[model samples]
Target: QGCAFEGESCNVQFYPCCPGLGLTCIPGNPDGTCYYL
Candidate 1:
């Protein structure tokens, strides 16, 4: 299952990505964060 919505955070288990989703501990802006498609 995954939580998909506009202006929403990613709660999905896992998906195909180069950098992957964001984590709070890491620390950084959502848009500024690095993630690959």
Candidate 2:
């Protein structure tokens, strides 16, 4: 899973993909939870 905008969450590895616009990815959890920063 992946996110492209704010208020959304995505896979850490795929957070930079999909839509791939101004989306920013950052690891938010040690359990693989990522956030769109």
Candidate 3:
């Protein structure tokens, strides 16, 4: 429902995640992921 989670994929246009939680998106091979630091 939201954006990429702390450990979720972020390479799809219609994917879901946890953005408001204060997570960031980083580049990856197959797909990027969201991380909180």
TM-score of each: 0.22, 0.30, 0.48
Candidate 2 scores a C-alpha RMSD against the true structure in Å of 4.4
Model 3, residue 4: displacement in angstroms?
A: 1.7
- Local lDDT at 28 for model 1: 24
Decide which is better by TM-score, 2 or 3.
3
Residues 1-37, model 1: lDDT tens digits: 4333333343334311123343321112222222323
The predictions' CA RMSDs to the true structure, in order, are 8.1, 4.4, 3.2
lDDT sort, best first: 3, 2, 1
Candidate 3 lDDT, 1-37, residue by residue in tens: 3466788876545554455776656664435787777
TM-score for candidate 1: 0.22
lDDT of 2 by residue, 1-37 (tens): 4444554565555553245454444453422333343
Error of 1 at 34 (Å): 13
Mark the regions of model 2 whose C-alpha exceeds 4 Å error after superposition.
1-4, 13-17, 28-37
Alpha carbon lDDT at 6, candidate 1: 33
Collision pairs in model 1: none
What's the distance in Å from true for residue 31, model 1? 12
lDDT at position 36, candidate 1: 25
